[PDB]
Amino acid sequence: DNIIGTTTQEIDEHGNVKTIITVKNQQIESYTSTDSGTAKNRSTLTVNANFLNDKYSNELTTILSLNGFIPSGRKFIFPKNNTLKGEMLWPQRYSTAVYNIPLDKSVKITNSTPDNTIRSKEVSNSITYGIGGGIKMEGKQPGANLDANAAITKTISYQQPDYETAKTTSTVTGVNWNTNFTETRDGYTRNSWNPVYGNQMFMYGRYTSNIRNNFTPDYQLSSLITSGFSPSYGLVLRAPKDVKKSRIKVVFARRSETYQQNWDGLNWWGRNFYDTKNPDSLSKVTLTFELDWQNHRVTFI
Amino acid sequence: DNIIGTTTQEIDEHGNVKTIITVKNQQIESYTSTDSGTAKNRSTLTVNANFLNDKYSNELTTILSLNGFIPSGRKFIFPKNNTLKGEMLWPQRYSTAVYNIPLDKSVKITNSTPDNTIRSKEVSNSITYGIGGGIKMEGKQPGANLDANAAITKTISYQQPDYETAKTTSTVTGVNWNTNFTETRDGYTRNSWNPVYGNQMFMYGRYTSNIRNNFTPDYQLSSLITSGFSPSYGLVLRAPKDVKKSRIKVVFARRSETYQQNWDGLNWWGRNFYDTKNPDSLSKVTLTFELDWQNHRVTFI
Amino acid sequence: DNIIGTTTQEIDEHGNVKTIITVKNQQIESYTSTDSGTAKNRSTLTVNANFLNDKYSNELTTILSLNGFIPSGRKFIFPKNNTLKGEMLWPQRYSTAVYNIPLDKSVKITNSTPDNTIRSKEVSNSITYGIGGGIKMEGKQPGANLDANAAITKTISYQQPDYETAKTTSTVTGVNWNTNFTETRDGYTRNSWNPVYGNQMFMYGRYTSNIRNNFTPDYQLSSLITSGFSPSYGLVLRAPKDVKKSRIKVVFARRSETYQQNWDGLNWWGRNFYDTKNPDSLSKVTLTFELDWQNHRVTFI
Amino acid sequence: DNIIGTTTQEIDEHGNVKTIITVKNQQIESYTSTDSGTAKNRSTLTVNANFLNDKYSNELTTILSLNGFIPSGRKFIFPKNNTLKGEMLWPQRYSTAVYNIPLDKSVKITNSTPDNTIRSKEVSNSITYGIGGGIKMEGKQPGANLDANAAITKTISYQQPDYETAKTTSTVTGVNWNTNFTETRDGYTRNSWNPVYGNQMFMYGRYTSNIRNNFTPDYQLSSLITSGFSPSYGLVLRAPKDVKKSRIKVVFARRSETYQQNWDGLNWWGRNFYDTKNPDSLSKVTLTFELDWQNHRVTFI
Amino acid sequence: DNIIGTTTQEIDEHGNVKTIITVKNQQIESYTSTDSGTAKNRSTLTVNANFLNDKYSNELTTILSLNGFIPSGRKFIFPKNNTLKGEMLWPQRYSTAVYNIPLDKSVKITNSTPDNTIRSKEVSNSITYGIGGGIKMEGKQPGANLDANAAITKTISYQQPDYETAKTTSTVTGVNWNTNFTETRDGYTRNSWNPVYGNQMFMYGRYTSNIRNNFTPDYQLSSLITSGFSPSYGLVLRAPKDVKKSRIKVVFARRSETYQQNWDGLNWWGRNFYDTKNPDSLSKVTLTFELDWQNHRVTFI
Amino acid sequence: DNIIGTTTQEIDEHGNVKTIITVKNQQIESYTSTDSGTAKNRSTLTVNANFLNDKYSNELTTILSLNGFIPSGRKFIFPKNNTLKGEMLWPQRYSTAVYNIPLDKSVKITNSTPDNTIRSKEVSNSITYGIGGGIKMEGKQPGANLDANAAITKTISYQQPDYETAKTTSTVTGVNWNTNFTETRDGYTRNSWNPVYGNQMFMYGRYTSNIRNNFTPDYQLSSLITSGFSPSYGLVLRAPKDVKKSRIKVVFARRSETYQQNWDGLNWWGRNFYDTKNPDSLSKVTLTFELDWQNHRVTFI
Questions:
Q1: What values do phi and psi take at B220, rounded to 5?
Q2: DSSP tally for chain E: helices H, then strands E
Q3: Which of D54, D118, D182 sits opposite E32 (nearest CB)?
Q4: Which chain E residues are Cβ-neighbours of D141 within 8 angstroms?
Q5: CA distance C295 to chain B (A)
Q6: Radius of gyration over alpha carbons of chain F, in Å?
Q7: What are the structural domains, with CATH classification, of chain F?
Q8: Which of D23, D120, D182 sits opposite E161 (nearest CB)?
Q9: Do β-strands E141-161 and E120-138 pair in parallel, antiparallel, or remain unpaired?
Q10: D144, burial (CB in 10 Å: exposed 0-12, middle 13-18, buried 19+)
Q11: Quick check: F152 and E129 in contact, CB under 8 A?
């Protein structure tokens, strides 16, 4: 645990002093370091490194913990004179790429986190058979009836995150994760389309008078849309005991889409698209770190 | 734990120094190693080896943890001139075979994971009997009524993964696992067929204008289809105490199927098949590792 | 735990060295061994033996852990010209017999696992009484009605494994377990019969055009049917301290049945039977191990 | 735990050797033994004895664990010429009696397990009052309506084992447990009777063609009916500190009943009875063990 | 825990032997004893005594654990010639009284178990308001309707043991517990009465042909009715350090009632009463124990 | 724990004996005592005192555990000649007051238990909107229909004890708790009243023949009504380190009410009232204890 050893001093009746020092010897020694950096678009990344040295092994292991923040950069665009139009630029996808750049000796990535987990759902099937009959008397006139029925039901239940994360690339030299928007609380997607109202994705109402009040309230949206992303990854690098230095290059990409609302005369109708000819539809940034394996240090460049 | 022993130094009042070194003896000694590799199709495998030497065993035991990543190799094919057709190449099955190649002394596989677990479901049967009667008065005309009924219900509930993994072969010289696609979130399979719309497996809508917008959203698909597979296996190898080296041959196979959509004039209809005339319908790769039992090392070739 | 003792060396100020060795004395000493073997039909078995010696007891105890794999050997048989017929050979029952063969001194089986556990179900009974009445006015003509009813319900809920395991024999010289197929996910059995469709056990649809697409998808079947069995047992053998050797003979039996589909003109109908005149309907195998109680070893013959 | 003490050796710089032996003294000493036996009807019993000697007790205490296996002895009887009749002999009740036979000094049974636990059920009562009214217009003719109602419900829920175990006798010299059949999964009992079909206890169908296919599938029966019983009991014996030996007499009784099916011309009808003229309707067996309290040993005779 | 101390022997290089003995001093010393006894009606009781001595206290504390078994003594009485009558004698109430009889010095009961716990239930109240309306067209004739309703529901849920235990007396010299029958699984009581069928308490059917098959199956009854009671109590006695002996007198009372069935011509009707003029309607027994506080012993007289 | 220290003896090779005694010093010392008493109405109280002396406190702390038993004192009164009337005297309220009587130095009550906890309930509100329509054809005459609706629901769920306990007074010199009857299992209270049947609080039936069979079964009543109360309280007393003695006065009050049933000619009707002219309607008792803080003793007077 936290105790590295003990220091003792014995003092006899004549002022003589004896000193006893005890230290614990460990199989694996751990040295830690941490550095942070911020980019031009105010995206931040903190790197926590845990340099492990296995005295009974022929390799060095460094465990990295990547913790960051990327602002959504969501915007609202309203024509000054036209009140029949409205736009909202929102973060459709957050991407993160990590590159392993050896400088002197070979270094590899042996583990990435998180990985692509297989998900499940709950399924229930039901079947029902019915039998019924009866007799009646209306005044002095009898009646009868015989009935039967059958029904089949199937229910599927699952868990749905506001954003889905999966890795598309994972080699010994690089890893890439994609955090994508799924569907709204309402249940709408980017594929949603209605003949009358188009895409009702981020629409509050259909007959709302004011366009500037007809976007879904922030509390009904993910914090990733309204505020920002707080990603967390982990890596494991391995190398020979005689490695001196290596680097880590992280790339942040924020792909935003445009949600537009139009009044056709009777109601609002919306369309969701990727706005080419907009510099704000894509924001890419790089943050670079260097690892000193011998002196156990992490530094941001 | 990580504490192998203690070092103590006693310092006399005259500068005399005594040194006491204590080490603890273990019944089982554990040495670990790890190496990684990437293949031509950008699939990677990491091998974590745990060499155990049990003084109370007459054999050596090595616990391997196989962790890798296989990209889906998912593709979209749209004809340049034809806008009435579209294809999506997706990973139907992921396979992994591990081979045990003894070099000097004999080596066997005594345990593979995961195994074929027997699953269960929840069943409920119900039966109901009903009896009813009443009297009536319409103006001055009386009435009466007698009814009876019975119903039978049966409900079955279980858990359903997006992909199912099972081992088809498991000898002391080789093991093979198959991770197969099950059914869509919708509930569709590769057997699904409709006279009008064919197989609606990955169909968003039936009357969609753009073919490039008529495929199911990524958030409604498994990460194994959209992004990639993150398999995890484990093996236990045993050998004579004087074995020197042995090898491991791992084979990755990704079997892809083709989902095709066609416009027939009124709606979209789809069919799912295996394209025997496409080189991308099957991707096989090999990764070879060597184990040094004496020096407790793992190396990738 | 893992610490057997401690070794210490004290070095005074003149290079004198003292050595202190401490070992823990235990009431029960445990020695372990493991061997594996594979049979002609590629069924595998791993035996883990734990030889216990109670220094304060007059007996030796050996705890065995039997872990194996038996392939299903499932096949599909389609007549070349006839397209109105189809067969599927599937593993109805997996059996395992273990025999205790003493060579020198007496040895007995004191424990087998798993045993025959008594199961339970959840039961709910309900009863309802109803009373109703009302008045009406149609134009200027009054009306009245008095009604009453009663209902009784009973629901039974339980857990249903895809395969059921129970031991039919358990003496001090031998044990036998049977793992039997229960019912399909659908709820069908080997006893199921319909006048129109016969046994719909492994039938996908009733009006399917192609016979080779009309068998239930692998994901709707147990891994024991599609892939294989991964059985796990445990035994406890006891003997006098002066026993030298004994053997263990394991017998694996796989009993397969044939599910056949026929087209009658309007729909598919199936029948499930045991195909005598088929060499593949039964697969029996033997694996033999020897135990050296004195040298604590397990060996496959 | 398993550590009884430590042995230490100090080795001087001149080859002088000091030996220090430490043993820990216990308040309660535990010695264990186990013996097994099989009877003429292939039923087995294993006795696990735990001899406790508590220096702070004025008596000796022995904890016995009785674990055995009794085959169901289930049979099927079909007349050679008659195809309109069938029988199934099944185990209605399993009984176990344990007798305490003191030899030199007195011995008593101070605790038996399991005991007769008081069970519980879940009860819910509901009551509902309803009030309704409305107005109507059919063309130009008004209408009105007033209704009211009330309902009463009661639901009872509990857990139901396939077999129920209870002790009918428990003195300091003998104990007897009875494991009786309760009801079928269907919900039928030995009291069930229908005027048309009689007792449908183990009847698959009413109009089944083959008598040999008209019995309930094994997966719908308890392992106690299809395969066998795995009883588990425990006893606590106490004696004077100077007792030398004592005995244990265990009696296994398997009471079987006969389920008969008959074809009456239109359907199958069944009846369940006890065949007093069949030697296989009752199977009783005895197994005797001896306990050596001084040498802490269990032996089967 | 179980370790009372350690014994050590040091042997130098010349055969000299040093002995070191270490014992743990405790604040409270515990001595245990146990005796059992059986009565004339085969009711058994085991007394477990735990004599505690607090060296820093002025009192002695003895913790008793009372564990027993009382057979139900249930009987069936059928008239030899009359087949229109039947009786079942069953255990309505089990009672236990414990008396504290000081012989030399004062002794008191400071604790009895179990005590009278306050129970709870779950309550749910609901209220619903409804509003409805619609229009219609029958041919060319319009229609309209406006409806409204309201409902109130209340549900009460609780747990119901087959038998209820409560103490009616608890002084420093004696304690009495009563275990009473509550209601059947069906929901019937001893107060239940129907004008047609009387008390249907232990009635299987109303139109059953044979009286000897018209009692509820054992599995639908408590084990306390069919088999016996397995009571468990605990007491705490306290006295001055100079007490020598005291006694414990336990009284077992089993109060049985008679359930009678009669055929009136159309159906069965039953009545439940306490059969005076029946010696089997009440069974009272006494078991006496003596406690030696100084020598820590329990003995049955 | 219970270990206060260790005693060691070293025995030389010449019979020399060294003795080492080790005791552990504690921050908080705990001395316990217990005394019991019974009152004229056969209600008992046990006081468990835990005298804590914390060297790091400037005060002495005594934790008392008050555990007792109060009989219900439940009675049944039936007039000798009148068979049309009946009474049941039952315990409506249990009260306990504890008084702190300082003798030499000051003593206060700093904590009482249980306290008045704020309770909660579960609330669910629902709202539903419905829309419907359809077309019809009766022979050759068309029809149409349009409906709409809305509903509002509110459900409240909580837990309800048979008796409620709350403290009405809590100063540093005295405490008082009241355990009051709440409602019956039926749901009736002391406020319940029906114009026809009055208060049906403890009424089994309305037309019951025998008055002595028309009271609710014991299993449907609380143990506090049928048998007795088992109250449990706790107090914490604090005083100066040099306090010598102090006293405790406990008062038990059992307030009983009268439930009366009368036959009016057609049915039974009941009323619940407090009988001011019956000496058994109220029972008050006092029990006095003395605490010796210096010698850590509890004594009953």
A1: -100, 5
A2: 1, 18
A3: D54
A4: none
A5: 9
A6: 31
A7: 5-300 (2.70.240.10)
A8: D120
A9: antiparallel
A10: middle
A11: yes
